[PDB]
Design a protein around this ligand. Structure first.
Ligand SMILES: FC(F)(F)c1cc(-n2ccnn2)ccc1Cl
Ligand SMILES: *[C@@H]1O[C@H](CO)[C@@H](O)[C@H](O)[C@H]1NC(C)=O
Length: 351
């Protein structure tokens, strides 16, 4: 259990129920690389569906029952056999306890039953880590899976601005967004369960006092900031380098699309979803998008097994690092499958 819990010293920065937020840390004294990982786990967007989440997903809304340690897995592992990419880095796991896709800036108060502080949690973790060795870093990689991957897209440029304003312009801030690149597409068939993500995010932003990156906000303007939660719309507005990992047939995407022998209508729907996803990645130079039906990858212990065009994700990330020192021979960073059906790639996770 190699990462140790630290609750935030600023106890005004809280989980949904007012308990302090926090982070799990494993330092690597001989390293100037820092990996800050944002946990996922959907979201809630009104009193009734947040109350239900508090009953059966309470660790996603409160720190009162968190364990003192967590084991680092996948990209958070310190063993080179499990993590060829960054096994020697300083490792930070930030639990998701704000239910706001890491976008909120609202406290619990006489008018708010819950606090939605995801964007402030990230900034306060960064602030407190500067005193624990981050001040010496060369690279800060903000990574995340699922809602945490969307959280990377929403917060990577604000972390860069924070460090510049605090006096640390030499720390290179980068993002790694895993399974958080969603499409606001037409559902296959069309309350909490009946609310499409565009409408649920629109309501969430108001409930959370949600915030989005500045350039994206200026493009879409008031009332339309929900657009910035969709990767293909927010990514072109970002200045920090961001590596995008996305299954072409993501299970959470299919869930919001109301998809579960496949006949022609659904066959064409699935094939068109894969084609649309591949199209949105055409101009993303650092990306890894295998043709599999799955969800999340980078903190799985067997994350090294999947390959696109014969290149694994830890290798692609290493090639990305090299590229950030014109292309590299045999060290690709843009890896998007072209085959049109789940598991047409033989290295897909077996389940
Ligand atoms: F696809 C959606 F629904 F749009 C989407 C899905 C999530 N999600 C799923 C699991 N964890 N977070 C978050 C934001 C968005 Cl935008
Ligand atoms: C604590 O965090 C709050 C909320 O982000 C911030 O406004 C304030 O500057 C911090 N206060 C203290 C006492 O650290």
């Amino acid at each position: 259990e190699d990462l140790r819990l630290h609750l935030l010293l600023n106890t005004s920065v809280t989980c949904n129920d007012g308990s302090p937020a926090g982070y799990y840390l494993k330092e690597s004294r001989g390293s100037r690389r820092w990996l800050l990982f944002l946990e996922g786990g959907w979201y809630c967007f009104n009193r009734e569906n947040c109350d239900s989440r508090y009953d059966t997903m309470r660790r996603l809304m409160s720190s009162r029952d968190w364990p003192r340690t967590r084991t680092g897995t996948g990209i958070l592992s310190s063993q080179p056999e499990e993590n060829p990419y960054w096994w020697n880095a300083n490792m930070v796991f930030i639990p998701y306890c704000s239910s706001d896709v890491w976008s909120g800036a609202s406290s619990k108060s006489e008018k708010n039953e819950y606090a939605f502080m995801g964007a402030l949690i990230i900034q306060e973790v960064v602030r407190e880590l500067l005193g624990r060795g981050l001040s010496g870093a060369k690279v800060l990689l903000l990574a995340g899976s699922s809602a945490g991957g969307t959280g990377v897209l929403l917060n990577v440029d604000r972390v860069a601005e924070q460090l510049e304003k605090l006096g640390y312009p030499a720390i290179q801030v980068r993002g790694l967004a895993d399974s958080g690149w969603f499409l606001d597409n037409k559902q296959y068939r069309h309350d909490t369960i009946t609310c499409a993500p565009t409408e649920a995010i629109r309501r969430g932003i108001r409930y959370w006092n949600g915030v989005v990156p500045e350039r994206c906000r200026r493009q879409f303007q008031e009332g339309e900031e929900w657009n910035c939660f969709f990767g293909y719309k927010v990514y072109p507005t970002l200045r920090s380098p961001v590596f995008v990992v996305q299954w072409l047939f993501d299970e959470a995407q299919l869930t919001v699309d109301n998809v579960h022998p496949v006949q022609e209508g659904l066959r064409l729907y699935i094939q068109n979803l894969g084609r649309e996803l591949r199209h949105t990645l055409k101009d993303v130079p650092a990306s890894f998008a295998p043709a599999c039906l799955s969800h999340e990858i980078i903190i799985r212990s067997h994350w090294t097994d999947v390959q696109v065009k014969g290149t694994s994700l830890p290798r692609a990330l290493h090639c990305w690092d090299r590229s950030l020192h014109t292309p590299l021979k045999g060290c690709p960073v843009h890896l998007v499958d072209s085959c049109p059906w789940p598991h047409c790639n033989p290295s897909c996770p077996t389940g």
